[PDB]
């Protein structure tokens, strides 16, 4: 029994030694030469209001115009960004919604929360009313993130240390990913859609192969829980935001910490992170009522989107990178550009 | 300016906004309560008597006041990641059994720690607590079997039901680190017929009166 623990410690030491050997050059040492990005001034082009409670998540449609936002009032609102109209207002059965997703094709929109159930809502329906398509029961902990892998199957992360891949037509989880030591709070599919990553309150991130069914790599370095994840657009790196007030860029191939973004004044955690289209800007929302735009290559704090009355809870950059929408607990989504 | 059907879209948005406002008002009229306490503390029995795979929601209607009681005991996951969802709840019902000396690994001390954690939570600085002390009928003799000194060496002065219960009440009420911002309303259920619902209504209406009183500057 104890011999197995010794073997695990030896394997951890071997991994640590290999990663340290691979660290032949810090990212800052090589990215210092490039010209820094100047202060990024962004104005709230639109203010999407109508929610009566905290915004807990939002997602951009693949067309870069429609965006769905979820809040504790028990409503999913599908805003048209270019005009701020309510295309749809889906009333939820359980108002404790902690995440939402917009299907890549735009037909379906999913959301989940403390009910432990991921509900799929069909938008392009003949009857004209958004009716729930399915309820993917099977989890034992609150749902913290949903992302449509396809119109047929999706992937869900829960607070019971498990992640899952569900088939929507069958309504049962085709794959179950296990290995986390604590609650899983965030999830983000890869650009190629074959791999994804999940960050957990065990202060670690996991890279999962969807089809294989088992993790490939584990990334450590955070001091506290991870609340947000996003894939670098190239698909070969991802940035994690945690409660220890530090964002961190990890590289899959190098399999180690690449950079850390933090500031002494910044003492609270990160609720959501997202990249820019070129990957040169990393926008992270903080508990301190405002979001910060970081030069992802030089780590310099490039800008501040301080416009929210309460905690910023979610944010997302369109597919074309035209605008970044941020939603906070003061119930207003604002689109900066 | 707007096209023939852009105006139609704007009209649809305005109608959706009207529906959203109506639903928001209806939801604001409702009272919300968060239910906490150990499963063996009679919480299930309390909700059953008062009601006349994750979060559970119960709906009551007493004296024209709609109560939404969120029983979240089934969420056997990490707290501090979903507790802030209930930041705006108007009260925290907190059940505890007066006979919690049984499961010695003591459970009275564990309930005390839980109450200390919940009362002083930064999310519940304003949210008041409605403390329920259950198992009075059998506690009245369990106290006779063994004195409170087995749990609190200080214990009740005279080992008696009344004095011991008052001591337990005081012990749990002094855990409130913010006397000004909260009022811990305590009740001894004793498996009463319907006094639980009436007491919840009284505590809730008092909390509402004081919330309005604070909003309009009188308090």
């Amino acid at each position, epitope marked *: 029994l104890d011999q197995l623990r010794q073997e695990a410690e030896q394997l951890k030491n071997q991994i640590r030694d290999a990663r340290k050997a691979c660290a032949d050059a810090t990212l800052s040492q090589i990215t210092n030469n490039i010209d820094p990005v100047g202060r990024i001034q962004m104005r709230t082009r639109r203010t999407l209001r109508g929610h009566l409670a905290k915004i807990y998540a939002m997602h951009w449609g693949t067309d870069s115009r429609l965006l769905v936002s979820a809040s504790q009032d028990g409503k999913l609102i599908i805003w*048209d960004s270019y005009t701020t109209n309510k*295309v*749809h207002a889906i009333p939820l059965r359980s108002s404790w919604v902690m995440t939402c997703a917009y299907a890549p094709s735009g037909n379906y929109v999913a959301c989940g929360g403390l009910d432990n159930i991921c509900s799929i809502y069909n938008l*392009k329906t003949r*009857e004209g*009313n958004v009716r729930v398509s399915r309820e993917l029961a099977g989890h034992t902990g609150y749902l913290s993130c949903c992302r449509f892998l396809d119109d047929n199957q999706i992937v869900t992360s829960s607070g019971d240390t498990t992640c899952a891949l569900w088939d929507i037509e069958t309504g049962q989880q085709t794959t179950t990913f296990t290995g986390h030591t604590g609650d899983v709070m965030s999830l983000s599919l890869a650009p190629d859609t074959r791999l994804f990553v999940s960050g957990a309150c065990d202060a670690s991130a996991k890279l999962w192969d969807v089809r294989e069914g088992m993790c490939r790599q584990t990334f450590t370095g955070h001091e506290s829980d991870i609340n947000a994840i996003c894939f670098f657009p190239n698909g070969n790196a991802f940035a994690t935001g945690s409660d220890d007030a530090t964002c961190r860029l990890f590289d899959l191939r190098a399999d180690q910490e690449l950079m850390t973004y933090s500031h002494d004044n910044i003492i609270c955690g990160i609720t959501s992170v997202s990249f820019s289209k070129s990957g040169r800007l990393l926008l992270a929302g903080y508990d301190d009522f405002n979001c910060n735009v970081w030069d992802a290559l030089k780590a310099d704090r490039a800008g501040v989107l301080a416009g929210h009355d309460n905690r910023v809870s979610c944010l997302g950059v369109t597919d074309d990178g035209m605008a970044v929408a941020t939603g906070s607990w003061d119930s207003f989504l604002k689109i900066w550009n | 300016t707007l096209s023939a*059907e*852009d105006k*139609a*879209a704007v009209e649809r948005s305005k109608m959706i906004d009207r529906n959203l406002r109506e639903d928001g008002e209806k939801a604001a009229r409702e009272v919300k309560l968060l239910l906490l306490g150990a499963g063996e503390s009679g919480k299930n029995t309390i909700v059953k008597q008062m009601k006349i795979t994750g979060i559970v929601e119960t709906h009551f209607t007493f004296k024209d006041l709609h109560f939404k009681m969120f029983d979240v005991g089934a969420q056997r996951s990490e707290r501090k990641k979903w507790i802030h969802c209930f930041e705006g709840v108007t009260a925290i019902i907190f059940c505890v059994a007066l006979s919690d000396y049984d499961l010695v690994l003591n459970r009275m001390h564990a309930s005390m720690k839980l109450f200390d954690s919940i009362c002083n939570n930064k999310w519940f600085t304003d949210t008041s607590i409605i403390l329920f002390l259950n198992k009075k009928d059998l506690f009245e003799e369990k106290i006779k079997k063994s004195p409170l000194t087995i749990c609190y060496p200080e214990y009740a002065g005279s080992n008696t039901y009344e004095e011991a219960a008052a001591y337990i009440q005081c012990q749990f009420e002094d855990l409130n680190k913010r006397k000004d911002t909260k009022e811990i309303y305590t009740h001894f259920t004793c498996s009463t017929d319907t006094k639980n619902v009436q007491f919840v209504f009284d505590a809730v209406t008092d909390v509402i009166i004081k919330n309005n009183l604070k909003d309009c500057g009188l308090f």
Partner: single-chain antibody, 232 residues
Framework: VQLVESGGGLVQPGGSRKLSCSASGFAFSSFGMHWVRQAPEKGLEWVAYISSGSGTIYYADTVKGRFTISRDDPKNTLFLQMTSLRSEDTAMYYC??????????????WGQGTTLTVSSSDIVMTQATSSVPVTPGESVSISCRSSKSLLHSNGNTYLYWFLQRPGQSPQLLIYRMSNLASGVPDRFSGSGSGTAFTLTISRLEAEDVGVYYCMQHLEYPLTFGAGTKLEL
């Protein structure tokens, strides 16, 4: 999804009649509705429009102040009250559906039609040919022209193409002049620019023969084309 309708029949000139349109199988309360007429042997002609919630109403100038459009959501019904009817009002009336939100498909579903026999600034739109001979398996194009460009500033060319097969109510084929209505065989394609639009059919086969109608929804009234017939 279904829209039955009744109330038509023989009415002497100067009388009145209330056409009723009973809707079932869809969310009526959220759908704006139209009444569209078609003469006994001529093309379509828009009659009236009522938005969801009855907050907006429009009438064709030839019935303004004579026809009143109403809607009762609780019973899911639509009403057209006509008074002082004339010989020009004899036609088949169709209860037409329409939902307006970004990316919607207005005029998707049409009623079965109710006939009405009476005892004895607008954007002009035209179609090149009234009747075209076609051969199955061939590719055929239909051309249409508008008086003024239909390309609004936002970029939506508000042109619509409808198909009316013999003895059947017209069904939407194309909306916005490029988007393809759901359920069509996918052979049809819409293209063109302001004042000149076209509908192309590749690999023509059965069920295509019929009258094609063009329409615009840039400004009211919604002027229809004269109709182009494809016959064997």
């Amino acid at each position: 999804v279904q829209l039955v309708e009744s109330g038509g029949g023989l009415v002497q000139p100067g009388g009145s009649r209330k056409l009723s349109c009973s809707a079932s199988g869809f969310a009526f309360s959220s759908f704006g509705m139209h009444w569209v007429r078609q003469a006994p042997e001529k093309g379509l002609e828009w009659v009236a429009y009522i938005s969801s919630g009855s907050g907006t109403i429009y009438y064709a100038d030839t019935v303004k102040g004579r026809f009143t459009i109403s809607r009762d959501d609780p019973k899911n019904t639509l009403f057209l009250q006509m008074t002082s009817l004339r010989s020009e009002d004899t036609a088949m009336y169709y209860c037409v559906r329409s939902i307006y939100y970004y990316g919607s498909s207005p005029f998707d579903f049409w009623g079965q039609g109710t006939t009405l026999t009476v005892s004895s600034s607008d954007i002009v739109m035209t179609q090149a040919t009234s009747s075209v001979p076609v051969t199955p398996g061939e590719s055929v194009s239909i051309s249409c022209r508008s008086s003024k460009s239909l390309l609004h500033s936002n970029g939506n060319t508000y042109l619509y193409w409808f198909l009316q097969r013999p003895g059947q109510s017209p069904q939407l084929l194309i909306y916005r002049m490029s988007n393809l209505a759901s359920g069509v065989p996918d052979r049809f394609s819409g293209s063109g620019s302001g004042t000149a639009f076209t509908l192309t059919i590749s690999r023509l086969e059965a069920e295509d023969v019929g009258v094609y109608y063009c329409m615009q929804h840039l400004e009211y009234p919604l002027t229809f084309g004269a109709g182009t017939k494809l016959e064997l």
